[PDB]
Amino acid sequence: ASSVNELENWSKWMQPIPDSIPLARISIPGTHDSGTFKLQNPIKQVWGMTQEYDFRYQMDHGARIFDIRGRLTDDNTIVLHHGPLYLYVTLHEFINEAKQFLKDNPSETIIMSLKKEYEDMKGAEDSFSSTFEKKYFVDPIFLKTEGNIKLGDARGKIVLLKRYSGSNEPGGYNNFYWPDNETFTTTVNQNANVTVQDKYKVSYDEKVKSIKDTMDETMNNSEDLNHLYINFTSLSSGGTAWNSPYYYASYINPEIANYIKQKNPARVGWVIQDYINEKWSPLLYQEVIRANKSLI
Ligand SMILES: N[C@H]1[C@@H](O[C@H]2[C@H](O)[C@H](O)[C@H](O)[C@@H](O)[C@@H]2O)O[C@H](CO)[C@@H](O)[C@@H]1O
Numbered sequence: 001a002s003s004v005n006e007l008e009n010w011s012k013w014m015q016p017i018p019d020s021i022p023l024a025r026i027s028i029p030g031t032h033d034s035g036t037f038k039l040q041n042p043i044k045q046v047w048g049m050t051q052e053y054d055f056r057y058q059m060d061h062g063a064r065i066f067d068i069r070g071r072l073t074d075d076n077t078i079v080l081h082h083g084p085l086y087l088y089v090t091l092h093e094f095i096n097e098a099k100q101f102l103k104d105n106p107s108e109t110i111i112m113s114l115k116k117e118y119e120d121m122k123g124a125e126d127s128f129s130s131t132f133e134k135k136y137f138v139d140p141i142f143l144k145t146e147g148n149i150k151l152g153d154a155r156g157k158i159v160l161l162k163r164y165s166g167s168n169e170p171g172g173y174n175n176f177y178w179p180d181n182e183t184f185t186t187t188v189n190q191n192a193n194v195t196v197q198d199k200y201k202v203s204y205d206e207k208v209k210s211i212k213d214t215m216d217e218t219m220n221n222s223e224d225l226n227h228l229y230i231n232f233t234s235l236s237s238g239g240t241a242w243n244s245p246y247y248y249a250s251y252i253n254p255e256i257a258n259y260i261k262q263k264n265p266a267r268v269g270w271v272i273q274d275y276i277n278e279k280w281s282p283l284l285y286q287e288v289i290r291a292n293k294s295l296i
Helices: 004-008 033-037 040-046 055-060 091-104 128-137 202-219 244-261 285-291
Strands: 029-033 064-074 078-083 083-088 110-118 156-165 183-186 191-200 227-232 270-273
Touching: 004 191, 004 285, 029 202, 029 285, 033 055, 033 083, 033 128, 033 227, 055 091, 064 091, 064 128, 064 183, 078 091, 078 128, 083 091, 083 156, 091 156, 110 128, 128 191, 183 202, 191 202, 202 227, 270 285
Parallel strands: 029 064, 029 270, 064 110, 110 156, 191 227, 227 270
Antiparallel strands: 064 078, 078 083, 183 191
């Protein structure tokens, strides 16, 4: 319908947005290293954990972009990893949560970014991209439409954001040059541009400025429908309680949340964050979702 109050239902917040709006133009909360929630070993948690809750908790809190990092096993299935570590979560496991969620909330869409996080186990029969495409993508939940995907065509389906090469099947967002630890801008699909801020290995200070500056560039280019803006608030670092992603996010999330709160912008972009929870105020994911009041 037509009320900003509808953006307040985290489970169906995309319901009020017009079908004609390109997904790119929508401000969307996302989660970084989404599948790390099962990590229980203290040392592993410090070095790799970025989320405390599962996929379903994540989507019921408004997150629509999932950063999935896989690895081809001998058994010829794709499981989730954080570098060399297996996360006790599988790709099927993710797809099924997304399927259930999209069934209960058919107004929504889920964007799934897929990246090959580690090298294929030695005995696999096919390549990573090939297994993914013949064994999973082929599933009807995957949108096979490319171009500047519109919200209308996406609802009820999972939209792929390829972060792997060798893709032979058309659909979703195509792979694009993604340089290490920087903020950049290039082109995707056919004519659309993309600017990404992914300075994952920098100082806190440099990070907050990188986020704000990319966010500024976004709110100032609010009507450029064919421009993707992906902005990672996540930052990784050393191995101690005052250096871990949890420590940083406990600062970065409320800081960016308020930053959006006060600027009252029309466009915020795709904001991928660590630790989507309900501890810090204001809520980053909620402020990002509210920057959509202008589309209603
Ligand atoms: N960790 C490997 C990975 O880096 C990741 C970051 O860790 C972080 O999660 C970021 O948000 C991702 O976008 C980024 O891709 O990919 C690089 C490819 O150049 C490798 O060299 C690195 O060692």
